[PDB]
Every structure is written in C-alpha cells, then in structure tokens.
Amino acid sequence: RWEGGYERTWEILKEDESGSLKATIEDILFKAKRKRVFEHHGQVRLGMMRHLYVVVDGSRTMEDQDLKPNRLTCTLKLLEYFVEEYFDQNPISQIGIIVTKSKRAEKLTELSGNPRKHITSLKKAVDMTCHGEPSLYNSLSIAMQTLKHMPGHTSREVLIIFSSLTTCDPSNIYDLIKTLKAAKIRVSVIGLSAEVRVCTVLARETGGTYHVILDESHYKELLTHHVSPPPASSSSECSLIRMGFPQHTIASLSDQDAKPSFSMAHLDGNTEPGLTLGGYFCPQCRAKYCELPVECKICGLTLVSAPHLARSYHHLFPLDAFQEIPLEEYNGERFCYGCQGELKDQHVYVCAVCQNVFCVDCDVFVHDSLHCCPGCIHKIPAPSG
Amino acid sequence: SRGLNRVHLQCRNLQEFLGGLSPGVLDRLYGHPATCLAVFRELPSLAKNWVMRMLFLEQPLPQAAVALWVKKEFSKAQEESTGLLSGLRIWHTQLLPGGLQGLILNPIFRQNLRIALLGGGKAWSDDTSQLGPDKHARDVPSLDKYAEERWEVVLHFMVGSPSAAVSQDLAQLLSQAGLMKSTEPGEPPCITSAGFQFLLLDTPAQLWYFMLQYLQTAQSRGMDLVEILSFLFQLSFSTLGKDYSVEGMSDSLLNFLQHLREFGLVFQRKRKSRRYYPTRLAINLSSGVSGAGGTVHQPGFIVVETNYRLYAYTESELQIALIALFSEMLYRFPNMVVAQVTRESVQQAIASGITAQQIIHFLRTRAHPVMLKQTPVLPPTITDQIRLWELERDRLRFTEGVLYNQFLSQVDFELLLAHARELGVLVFENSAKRLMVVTPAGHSDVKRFWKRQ
Amino acid sequence: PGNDPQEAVPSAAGKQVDESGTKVDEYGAKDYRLQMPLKDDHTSRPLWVAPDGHIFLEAFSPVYKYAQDFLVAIAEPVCRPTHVHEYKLTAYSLYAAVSVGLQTSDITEYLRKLSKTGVPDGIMQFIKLCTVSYGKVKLVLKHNRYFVESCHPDVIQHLLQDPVIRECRMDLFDFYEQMDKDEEEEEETQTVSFEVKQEMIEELQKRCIHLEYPLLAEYDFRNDSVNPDINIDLKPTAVLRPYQEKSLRKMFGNGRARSGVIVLPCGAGKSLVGVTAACTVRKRCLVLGNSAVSVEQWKAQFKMWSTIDDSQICRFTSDAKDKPIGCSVAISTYSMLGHTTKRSWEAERVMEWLKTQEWGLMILDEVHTIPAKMFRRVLTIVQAHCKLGLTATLVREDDKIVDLNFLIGPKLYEANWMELQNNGYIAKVQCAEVWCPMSPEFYREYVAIKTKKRILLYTMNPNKFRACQFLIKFHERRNDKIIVFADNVFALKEYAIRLNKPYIYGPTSQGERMQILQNFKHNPKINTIFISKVGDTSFDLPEANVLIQISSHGGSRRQEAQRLGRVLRAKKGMVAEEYNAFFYSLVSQDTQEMAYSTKRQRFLVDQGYSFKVITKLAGMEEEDLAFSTKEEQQQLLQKVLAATDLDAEEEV
Ligand SMILES: [Zn+2]
Ligand SMILES: [Zn+2]
Ligand SMILES: [Zn+2]
C-alpha cells in the first residue's frame, strides 16, 4: 500500500529520458523553475521623506522554525540589511523601531536615522524571549501620539512585522480605522506565513499594502517592494521648509588650534555625550557637533546635506525601460554596448530610445546599480534643449 | 637539524647569488632581458615605488626626503623595504652632492630599464633575432602534453619508473644534487632525501636552481647568458621561429638547449634545430609564487571532511604517484580515495621533514578547482592536526656546540659572556651553574682569547 | 539451525582493489560519468559504484537527482559516515527485506538509472531477489489466515510444494457492525489467503517457508477486531514531536497488521513511541528491560504519558514481583537464566505469565547488548507475533554469520542526526579528546616499570587535574550543568578531596545518591558532579549539558559513546546555531591513552561529530591552579609511590 505509495512519489521523478542523456532535463526544469517577478514599477505621485514605524510581533509564533531556527532569525537578520539598504536608498526618512512583547508595545528605538543605533538595537533584539501575545492597539497608540506631533508635511507610514497570530488587543481597533484614516497615517503589515482578515481588512481600509510571507527569498521581495517610497494617498502635503544647509568645519580656519576640543558644554552644538574637535556647523543654532545629515534638537530644523539625500530619490523616479529580443541584429561586432561581450541567451536588451544592445549583466547593472541607461547619455545631452 | 632553505629561497635567488658575487659580475646581470627579472622576484610595494621616480630622476634626490617619505606608520616596513633594495647593489649612496648624502640608482640599469619602459628597438626588442611565427606547423596544447609528460618523466623517474628516462647526464647532476644519488654498482637513480622534498614541492624554480647550479660544476660558459636565457624563456609561448634561436645563437645557448628539451621546456625537432619553442611553463618560474594560473590540470573539488582524505577523480599516475608517497594501505578503486592515516602519512614526512605549507599547498593542489565554492577555512581543525603531527615527531633540534663548565671565577665568566656576546658565538648560557653554550666554530677565538688573557 | 536467510553477498571477485587496470563494470560507469559532464551539469556520477565493499553517495551536486536520493537511494545503504556537501559513504546489508514495497529488479533499474548504466558487478545481482516479498497476516480467526501477497506468481511454486508438505485447508445496533465487515476488502488486490493448519504446524512450516527462496513477514492484526481483552489505554495530553510521529507512520502506512523495528539515536523518544505503541495499538503489551535500571525508567514515562496505573503496573525483575496476578501491560527483563531452579515460582511466573501474555509486544532495547546465545532465548522462550527492536546500533559484535532480520523481521526506521541536531531538540556535542603535556616525573617511572602501577601513574596526574580544575570554573561562568566521569575511585576521590564536589562510587547508599540527583538535577546552586563506573551503568541516567571523561582504556567504543549519547542534553535555550552540548576527554600523551585516543578519534570520525583536540588551556595561570608547585605534585607523587594496584581497576 504505502510502502509502494511512498516510492510511487520517488520513482517517476527519478526517471527521465533514458538511454543516453539521463538526469539532464531534470536540471532544465530547475532552470525553468526560476525567473520570478521582476519589477512591475512605473509609478508617480507620492513617496518622499517617510517616517516608518517598525512594529514587531513578539509572540510564541517565533518558536516555530518554518524558515530558520527562529522566525525572528528569519526576521531580525534581514531587517539590518533592510535598514542599510533603506539608508542606502532613502536617507530623507527615519524609522520608529517599536516592539510588541507581552501584550504591550515598547518603542525600542526612537524615530531616527542613525543606523548603528538601529542595528545594535537589532543586535540587542537577538536574545528576545518574545513572551506573551501581540497587541497592536498599544502599538498604534505609540504610533498615533508620536506621529500626532509630527507635521502634516510628513509621510506617515507604518511597517508591521506580524506573526499572523490572534490580534490580542481590546479597545475597538476597528474604530481605529476612522482614527487613523482621518489622521492620514498609513499602516502596512505583512503576515508571517498566514493571514489575519481583520488586519487584512485593516490594510485594505488603510491603503497600506498587506502581504503574506511565503519564503525567505519571498521575504526579501516585499522588503524590497517596500524599500521604495510608495505613492500613498493624495492630499498629504506639497512642501517642507527651512532645510538647513550646514557647513563642514575644519577647525583650522583662521585660529590654528585655539580650542583643544570643540565640545565643552558651552559651544553651540556639541549635542551628544562625546568629545569632538569641530567638524560640522548648522545655520540656525549655529550648531557644531558630530556630523549628521538629518536634523537637530535646538534649531530643530532639518540638517539637510544635499549630495546625499537630495540626490538619492532625485534619480529614483525618472526611469524608463528596455526591451528584450531573441533576434540577431549583431550590433557591434557581436558585442554589447556596455560590457562588450556575448553569450547569446536570446535576451538582446535594447533601449527604448537610444536603442543600445545590452546583456543581463548590463541590464541588472542598470536596473539594480546604475538605474539609467548611459546610452541615453551621448544621445540626450548632445541635442538637449 | 634538517635543511629548510633548499625549498623556497625566492628573493635570495636574486640576492644571495647576486650579493654573493661581484658588482661587475652582477653588472653582467644588467642585460636588457634581465631588467624584468629585477622588479618581479622582489615583491615589496614600497621599494616598488622608490624605483618609479628614477626614470624621471636622473638627479640624486636627498636621502632624508625618502627616509621621511613615509611617517610614523610602518617605519620598520619602510626600513625593511630599504636596505634590501640597497642590498641589491642597484643604488649608489652619493657623498655630498649638495651638502649631504643623496641616494641614486645605478644608471646603467636605468639605461637598461628605460628601454624596457618606453621606446627602444634594441637587440632584445628587435633588429637581430628575437622571435618568429611564420606559419603554424605545431600547436601549444599538444606541446602542453609535452609540458606535462616531461615533468612526469622527470618526477616519476625520481621515484623510479617501470618505464625509462631519456639519455641524460642530468641524473648525474641530480645524483650530484643530493636530491638523487646512486651507489657505485649499476648506478641506481634513487632519491637521497631532497628530491622527495622536491616531490613535495611543485614549481620549476628548483630545476632553475640546479640549472643555476648547472654551470657551478666546473663549467665555464655564460652564467650571464643562461639567466638572460632564463628570462628569454619567460615569454609565454606562441613562437616557433625561422630557427630564430640559431640566428640569436651562442655556444651554451644551443647546447644547454639540448637540455631544455631534456628539461622539456623547449621542444626541438630533427637535428635539435630549425625552430625553438617556449612552453606555457614560462610564467610560473617568473614568480615561484602559487598563482591561479598554476593549476596544471583541473580535476575538481576536494575536501578532507572527517579528516579521511575524502576525494575522487581518477587522475594521471603522477598524482597517483604523488600520493603513492603519501597514501597507500587501504587504497580503493576508480576514484583515488586512499583512506587516512595519522601515523603513516605522518611517517611519510619523516624522509622529508615537515611539509607544513607543502600540505597546505597540495591541499590547494590535490584537486585544483576546490576554492571555487568551498570554505575559506578548508581544514577546520585539520591543519592543527597536521601541525601537531608535525609537531609530534620533531622531538630533536640538532645543534653542536662547545660548553664551558667549572669556570674558576664568576665575574670573569661574565667577561667571557660579554666576550662571546661580542663575538656572537654563544648560543645559550647558564649563569647559575657557570655554563655557556658556545659554537665550536667560534670556539677558537675564545680558545685564543683564554690562552692570552 | 534453520536460521539462514540471505547473508550479505560480497566475498570475492577482486584482487588488489586498485582496479586501475580492470574496473570493468566501473568502466561502464566511467564511460557515462565522464562522457556526460560537459555543459555545466554532470548528468553522470554513478554514486561511484564499487563492486566489493559498498558504493558511495555523490551528494555534492545533488540538486534534485541525488538530494531526493540523499534519502531514497539509502534504503539498502546505511550512510555510515556523515559529511559536508561532498561524498558520503555507506555500507550494505540485509536491508532489502525491509524494502519490500518495490522489486529488487525495480531498484536494479534505478540502480542503473542512477548510475547512468553504471553496470553492477553482478555481485548484487546474485543477491537481489533471494527473498521474494511475502507476508503473514494474523487474521480474525484466532491465529492467522494464510495470506500470500498482492501478486499471484508465488503460490505456483508454493502450493505445488507446501500442501504436499503440510496442507492449509438489534438492526441499527448491528447494521454498522457489518459495514465494518464490508470494509474487509480485497487486501489491496486479490490477497490469495488460505486457512490455518491447526496453529501448531506453522513452527513446523516457517522453517520450510524460507527453505526454498522466500521469506515471511509476521504481522499483528490486533486493532480492528480482537477476540481477547483490551486494556484501558489513555494518552493524557502527551504532546510529542515529528521525529517519532514519522516512526509509527512507518509502522503503520498499511492497515492494522504489520510489526516494526525502529532505530533511534541516543537519548531520543525511546520511552515514548513504545508507550505510544502501548496505547494506540490497544493491545496487552510487554517490555523487556535490559536491567532493572531500565525497568524503573520505562514505567516512569509510562506513568507520565499514560494514566494506566491503578496497580496496573507489572515490573518483573530483582524481587519486584509487582502485580503478578493479573497481567495487563508488563515490564520484564531478559530471563537469561538457564539455571537449575533459578527463581522457583518467580521465573515460573515469568514462564507462565508469558503464556498469559499470549503474544503482546516485544519491546526490546538495544539488542546489540543481546548475544546470539541469548538470541536463542529471544525466540525460544518468547514466541510472540509482533516485536519491537529499540536498537541504536546497526551492526554489532563482528558477527557477519548471523544477521538480525531473521530475528525481528524488517528494520523499519532510523532517524537522521542532521535533522535532530541541526533541526530538532538534540543538542550539538563538542567532542574533545584533550591531551596534556605531563610532568616527566610520571614517565621515567612509567617506562622503568612494566607493571600495572604504570597505568596509575599517568592517571594520577596534576596535569590532568590542571585540565580538570580548569573547565569547572570555566563553565561555572555559564551557570550550566557539568559532569565528570573518571576511571576509578581513589584517584577521583582526591579530586573530590581537593576541589570537593558531588560524587559517587560503587557501594554508595542509593538514597543519598538520589539526594545527589536532587542536589544536582534540581538544585541550581551546584552544577558540578562526579560519577564512577556504576552510575552510568547501574543507577542513573544522568541528565546534563557538559561531560568530561578521564577513562579511556577498554575497547568498547560505543558502550562509552552511548554513555555520552544519553547524558548530554540541551544546554540552554540558545538562540545561536552553535554547539552547546560538550564532551571532554583527558588523554595522557606518549601513552596507551595517546595510542587508544588515536583509534578512539578514529572511531569518532567513524561516525563523525563536532570534534576538536585542544592541548593548552585558555590561559592556565589565569586560574589559581592548585598543584602549581611540583613539590605539591611530589606530595601527590609519593602517595602514588605509596599506592597499590587496587586503585587501578574498574567494576570488572
Ligand atoms: Zn537654531
Ligand atoms: Zn550587456
Ligand atoms: Zn540609453
């Protein structure tokens, strides 16, 4: 019965085209198993200066293995990567690390952009018991009251790491729809390997996007989907003003070494508990402390540092696309317009405008690293006007 | 104890030789082919920039400017990069050009180097006989097999072939080398101790060393010539020549060439002539350093998981011979997976001494594309096993000496301490029992000193 | 006599196994393992079929081909070493009579289809179908119905031989009762089942059933219908884990009649699945404990995960005599007696309540412990119809003459270390054969004296103690359980004198030994304990996290390796994927201990675990080392000079 039936599963899958060329097409189906969802982007409108809120379910669902030795191990490790790749892409923003554990919510790291503080917090978050049940109501309470004091010229989005369990919290979180719909705060959850309808209704009543974790690769995809600053609901803001352009200071300008250290509890700046020698300078406090392209606590305006953060999204929107042809128009001497090679896996990648020939390793290098076709350069800037 | 300099010696090859001979004899080592030989068998990055000025520096720059080229960071590394470059005798310390010593290079090398930098259609560049591809009569991967099998008939006939070696007088030098030897009846081409070490080595630079020692056995030809010719081999391959090695001939240049097809690295046709052939072998001599190109054959991955030697790939018999010295006694079939012994392969280094890196080298040379997707730490603990195994049998450090006991005084013993420490002929002392371990070679100078007082 | 199924085949046809010349059937493989790997995949790789000995596993680019067959190809293999993503060797044995949902030619096809026509030597061929699949159902009419098979072409030899040896032959309250008898269908196809020859002839028959070329599979139809009584089973909230959930699923993938023998690793759910088989099966069962040591244990988790206890408890060794009158579910011990009135009425009860046991179940822990002389009394005394072999050992006692499927039938399941130690509750041991540089004033004497006081010399070593003193405080800092196993008492006694710890010996009072277990296994203040030869064997299963050993002299590799395999449990709830169970051994250099450890670490890498030899400490004088002066060691030395041979012998 089943001793045969356990091996009726194996026997055919083992078997293939016999005689010659055996265990060959089994490898071909594995390549045919590949090539999942690429981009499907092309959007406009919103996404600028997010104010994210990490919300972590700490529950007994973590004790199931399912991808890793812990579901936090699946979670927490790639959050650091998600932190770094965020600060890579979006430095104009800041993130609220808030942890739910034992039916409450602990705002673990404040809404800020200092990566080491966030990452070591995750390195502190390693040895978490995740005792108790999730409570989103305490999480939204922090999320309200913090972002309540943020301007309406702020992007208001929440990223919830939920372990798909029972949403164990009172006090009419169904009525928190109209609370937060009016409060123009977006809330995005993704479910860990299952679905919560109420939370699925929550996000579809939000405009925040809900998903379910499939796999570790798939876990990365939706992170990567939420790296990009999304086009949230209309009528948020237009502008955001008193973007402080700073100065770097060399502390060697006119008076050479007239100050042994530029942090002595009286100097304009010197914000954090450490010694400094003068590296930076804000306009409004005239605040000189450790360099930070974010904001301050006395002038209270945004320490904008343009080549970093006014450059990051500044080309992250205006992209175009390529096309693929299997044909052989042999442009070059059977070459690439970029790296100049050939393999011909029938993916001759042609630009939409300048129409230049590329490979996967030239398409990926654009569509992950270069983000534009340089074949448009020499082609845009020469007749540009 | 045991010799350990006969394995590597890869900067002293151009130093201990060169500094062991005269400046005018190494003035001969500034043939224009010998220019690339200088820069590469030394590997400092720090002296490798101190050269770079001198093509634009005819002038002797002052010593302090480059003595203070690099500040507080790595002053020793600057100093370690300095006197060795000076120990090449390529520099001249000027006296007082402007008021103080300002160093400068030998210009005749600067003459020779700049032709190998820009311009020059000279004798090595062109105009006399250098090189010549006329029409393809013979191909390189076919000759790569020659460049494999001559190594075999070298390395197998070291161990001993059921086949035979070609008619060489080289064995009478390799028996002379102390790699091989032969007792007088019939002259058996065995191994003494050192070919066994070279069996554990895999680079042609030892061959090169005995080929540098080839003229040393009372032969009087161009040592200047052959080391130029040692470079003149190091030209990759792809050249037959309209007998261009005879148009650029010399006496030893043709005769010792008969030996380079004995050494296999040249390939000579009918009458040992009409062409010449450098083999793809002509780039790993150039370093002696491991090299990703130095892969010979690409068998596969290995591992030594559960320290049980763990690999397959039915290879040629030379690798089988490379482990016939290294793994018998539970050999198996068609995959070459002789099991492990922590005693026998340990006993299989007793005729070599420690093969510490030579394990690690043949770790990355057993099956060659192993570093493609494997761990950086290829032996997890297994190096230390091999180490402790090597650190087991080495129970002795052989050292002769003369010892001075029952000395008549105690403070004059400290004089003879300070006397021998002046001489540097002491190895060890015991002051508590009035003892000094003194070299017996430097015994006589204290033996003379004690008899004088 | 009459105990001969097909023994393991390869004995000849091979000369200097370096078949650089012949490899003739491997040349058939080496054609297509080498002609096939050209374009970035191998489509080859015959598992390196070797005629004699065994063959291998590729398992380095398994992808789907051999990674599916990382398990499935291993049916008749056993995968005796384990590795990293590389090759993996095995052995070969009786394990086709277990693999009886498949034909020996069907595997032979896929044995070829894996090997890319890497052709057999034939050695396996002449050993493929030596025993055709054949079962022995025990159907409702009180003994057996003479089941043959799904397939017919076997009675054609059989019925032309066997009968000429020995013949064979209210409404709604009862409506569903025949609906159950409606479910008594064709036994998957045709059954071909005959009638019991009077219940006393099968013993006379079984010896001739195998006599041609067939082999028989005794079953246990004890679940749907059963004419005698059923005890009260009750599984009181005994949540268990998928290592052993798969196990009974292998015992029951078919209907309600098939016996079973399953291998676990050490310390696994041993007293669970049999207790699970005690209750789910609805039988009246039997345990055969190894000693009374086992007997107290196996009832205790039975007292835990079964509420079947209302003097419903039958433990039967060393004057236990607990519930003779009325047997429901029993624990016994292997009556190895054969003596002249050994236990007069007591073993008579063991005889006569075996008869009341009828068949029950043969719960058999670790039958590598059982000799073949006792394997006589396995079948001779106990004549049951379903067995249970709880034996971690696959191959034992170097006896390739008598195999074990003739004893217990098929050997059903073995559980992977990898899917317990990396994915599962079983902790990761760091094995440590630690050798030390001794003081030479133990060794000049040693080589002077060719008399067993020399054994005690390296034994009583402060260089051993400096290691012993070390890891105590080094693992006091992690606040986790540690246990040290010495060789003999009076050396170990001074360890319990110098750095005095919990400890035992041979004649120690058990009620205070139990207090020591209470002081150890409950009290968190002292995580340190000493044991002797007896405590591993005759009193306790210790439950700890870190083990140190001193004794390594006798060649019982596994017997020592199953001590550590039982004791070492999970250290903490560690988030990391590291090794958390810990083994330590103390090795004398230049010694029998140096020599034995070489074979011992050979046996360690024979099964293959996380192993490291360290020699130096993590800073020796970091700790205030006692015996730092060798004069103090000379004080110990003169005790050793005053010592006799009596401190230098174990329990045997
Ligand atoms: Zn300000
Ligand atoms: Zn391209
Ligand atoms: Zn373009």
Swiss-Prot record, chain A:
Keyword Plastid in record: no
Key words, A-Z: DNA damage, DNA repair, Host-virus interaction, Metal-binding, Nucleus, Phosphoprotein, Transcription, Transcription regulation, Zinc, Zinc-finger
Superkingdom, taxonomy of origin: Eukaryota
Gene3D superfamilies, per database record: von Willebrand factor, type A domain, Zinc/RING finger domain, C3HC4 (zinc finger)
Compartments in which it is found: Nucleus
Pfam families: C1_4, Ssl1
Listed InterPro entries: C1-like_sf (IPR046349), Ssl1-like (IPR007198), TFIIH_C1-like_dom (IPR004595), TFIIH_SSL1/p44 (IPR012170), VWF_A (IPR002035), vWFA_dom_sf (IPR036465), Znf_C2H2_type (IPR013087), Znf_RING/FYVE/PHD (IPR013083)
Positions where Phosphotyrosine occurs in the chain: Y86
Result when mutating C354A: No effect on the transcriptional activity of the reconstituted TFIIH complex
Consequence the record notes for mutating C299A: Reconstituted TFIIH complex lacks p62 and has no transcriptional activity
Result, substituting C373A: No effect on the transcriptional activity of the reconstituted TFIIH complex
One GO MF term: zinc ion binding
Keyword DNA damage: yes
GO biological process, alphabetically ordered: G protein-coupled receptor internalization; nucleotide-excision repair; regulation of transcription by RNA polymerase II; response to UV; transcription by RNA polymerase II; transcription initiation at RNA polymerase II promoter
Tissues expressing this chain: Widely expressed, with higher expression in skeletal muscle.
Residue intervals of the VWFA domain: 51-227
Zinc finger (C4-type): 282-299
One GO CC term on file: transcription factor TFIIH core complex
Family: Belongs to the GTF2H2 family.
Its biological purpose: Component of the general transcription and DNA repair factor IIH (TFIIH) core complex, which is involved in general and transcription-coupled nucleotide excision repair (NER) of damaged DNA and, when complexed to CAK, in RNA transcription by RNA polymerase II. In NER, TFIIH acts by opening DNA around the lesion to allow the excision of the damaged oligonucleotide and its replacement by a new DNA fragment. In transcription, TFIIH has an essential role in transcription initiation.
Family annotation (NCBIfam families): ssl1 (TIGR00622)
Name of the featured protein: General transcription factor IIH subunit 2
From Swiss-Prot, chain B:
Domain of life of the organism encoding this protein: Eukaryota
Gene Ontology CC terms: core TFIIH complex portion of holo TFIIH complex; nuclear speck; nucleoplasm; nucleus; transcription factor TFIID complex; transcription factor TFIIH core complex; transcription factor TFIIH holo complex
Entry GO MF terms: ATPase activator activity; double-stranded DNA binding; RNA polymerase II general transcription initiation factor activity
Example GO BP: nucleotide-excision repair
Localization in the cell: Nucleus
Record's keyword terms, sorted: DNA damage, DNA repair, Nucleus, Transcription, Transcription regulation
Record-linked NCBIfam families: tfb2
Entry remark concerning the domains of this protein: The C-terminus (residues 305-462) stimulates the ATPase activity of XPB/ERCC3.
Function text: Component of the general transcription and DNA repair factor IIH (TFIIH) core complex, which is involved in general and transcription-coupled nucleotide excision repair (NER) of damaged DNA and, when complexed to CAK, in RNA transcription by RNA polymerase II. In NER, TFIIH acts by opening DNA around the lesion to allow the excision of the damaged oligonucleotide and its replacement by a new DNA fragment. In transcription, TFIIH has an essential role in transcription initiation. Stimulates the ATPase activity of TFIIH subunit XPB/ERCC3.
Protein name: General transcription factor IIH subunit 4
Protein's organism: Homo sapiens
The encoding gene: GTF2H4
UniProtKB/Swiss-Prot annotation, chain C:
Keyword field: ATP-binding, Cockayne syndrome, Deafness, Disease variant, DNA damage, DNA repair, DNA-binding, Dwarfism, Helicase, Host-virus interaction, Hydrolase, Ichthyosis, Isomerase, Nucleotide-binding, Nucleus, Phosphoprotein, Transcription, Transcription regulation, Xeroderma pigmentosum
Outcome of swapping T90P: In TTD2; mild; wild-type dual incision, opening around damaged DNA and transcription by TFIIH
BP terms from Gene Ontology: apoptotic process; DNA repair; DNA topological change; embryonic organ development; hair cell differentiation; nucleotide-excision repair; positive regulation of apoptotic process; protein localization
Positions bound to ATP: L264, P265, C266, G267, A268, G269, K270, S271, R566, R569
Sequence positions bearing Phosphoserine: S610
CDD domains, per database record: DEXHc_XPB, SF2_C_XPB
Family affiliation: Belongs to the helicase family. RAD25/XPB subfamily.
Name of the protein in its database record: General transcription and DNA repair factor IIH helicase/translocase subunit XPB
Top EC category: isomerase
GO CC annotations, alphabetized: nucleoplasm; nucleotide-excision repair factor 3 complex; nucleus; transcription factor TFIID complex; transcription factor TFIIH core complex; transcription factor TFIIH holo complex; transcription preinitiation complex
Oligomer and partners: Component of the 7-subunit TFIIH core complex composed of XPB/ERCC3, XPD/ERCC2, GTF2H1, GTF2H2, GTF2H3, GTF2H4 and GTF2H5, which is active in NER. The core complex associates with the 3-subunit CDK-activating kinase (CAK) module composed of CCNH/cyclin H, CDK7 and MNAT1 to form the 10-subunit holoenzyme (holo-TFIIH) active in transcription. Interacts with PUF60. Interacts with ATF7IP. Interacts with KAT2A; leading to KAT2A recruitment to promoters and acetylation of histones. (Microbial infection) Interacts with Epstein-Barr virus EBNA2.
Any one GO molecular-function label of the UniProt entry: damaged DNA binding
Cellular localisation: Nucleus
Enzyme Commission number: 5.6.2.4
